[PDB]
């Protein structure tokens, strides 16, 4: 399952160093849903966090990436 | 003694690999609620609840918290 394409529907200015900043209409790539409000993604070659409320996500497809990783998933394997 | 959360100290820096995991520096004071598996604990660092890899900490030595919850325990009550 490739990373999920999204487009910014509003401007966003990141508040911390972990967050992406982007303008309405920005092409975004989404690796993984982190929580209800947040995705891990990428904008213009930079990895960072993306607020869900500011984007529209392309769904012609995967649930693995669009749902947060579960505890049982994480703890079933050693850490990297 | 008794049922309190178990204290631990980070012996190595750790950067969380998923959104469920705590990140901490060597020497961090950690609080451990419940062993999740051999390699993982449910705990807390600096007010944030998350997962802590066993191999990165030293634990201060109930068995209740230091052993993973059993199936029979979990299935003995309804979901959830």
From Swiss-Prot, chain B:
Residues with Phosphoserine modification: 66
Compartment(s): Cell membrane; Cell projection, Dendritic spine; Postsynaptic density; Postsynaptic cell membrane
Source species, domain of life: Eukaryota
Effect the entry attributes to changing residue 78 to Q: Increased interaction with ROBO1
Domain SH3: 4-61
Free-text comment about domains: The F-BAR domain mediates oligomerization, binds membranes, and induces plasma membrane protrusions.
SUBUNIT field: Homodimer. Heterodimer; forms a heterodimer with SRGAP2C, altering SRGAP2 function. Forms a heterooligomer with SRGAP1 and SRGAP3 through its F-BAR domain. Interacts (via SH3 domain) with GPHN. Interacts (via SH3 domain) with FMNL1 (activated by RAC1); regulates the actin filament severing activity of FMNL1 and actin dynamics. Interacts (via SH3 domain) with FMNL3. Interacts with RAC1; specifically stimulates RAC1 GTPase activity. Interacts (via F-BAR domain) with HOMER1. Interacts with ROBO1 and ROBO2. Interacts with FASLG. Interacts with PRMT5.
Medical condition linked: A chromosomal aberration disrupting SRGAP2 has been found in a patient with early infantile epileptic encephalopathy. Balanced translocation t(1;9)(q32;q13).
The protein's role, per its UniProt record: Postsynaptic RAC1 GTPase activating protein (GAP) that plays a key role in neuronal morphogenesis and migration mainly during development of the cerebral cortex. Regulates excitatory and inhibitory synapse maturation and density in cortical pyramidal neurons.
Other noteworthy facts: There are 3 duplications of SRGAP2 in the human genome as a result of segmental gene duplications. SRGAP2C is the only one to be fixed at a diploid state in the human genome. Moreover, SRGAP2C is functional, interacts with and inhibits SRGAP2 and is human-specific. The appearance of SRGAP2C in the human genome is estimated to 2,4 million years ago, which corresponds to the beginning of neocortex expansion in human evolution and it may have played an important role in this process through its interaction with SRGAP2 function.
Name of this chain's protein: SLIT-ROBO Rho GTPase-activating protein 2
Span covered, complete protein: 729 to 809 of 1071
């Amino acid at each position: 399952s490739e990373p999920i394409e999204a487009i910014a529907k509003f401007d966003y200015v990141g508040r911390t160093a972990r967050e992406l900043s982007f303008k309405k209409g920005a092409s975004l790539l989404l690796y993984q849903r982190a929580s209800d409000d947040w995705w891990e993604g990428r904008h213009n070659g930079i990895d960072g966090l993306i607020p869900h409320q500011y984007i529209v996500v392309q769904d012609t497809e995967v649930v693995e990436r669009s749902s947060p990783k579960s505890e049982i998933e994480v703890i079933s394997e050693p850490p990297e």
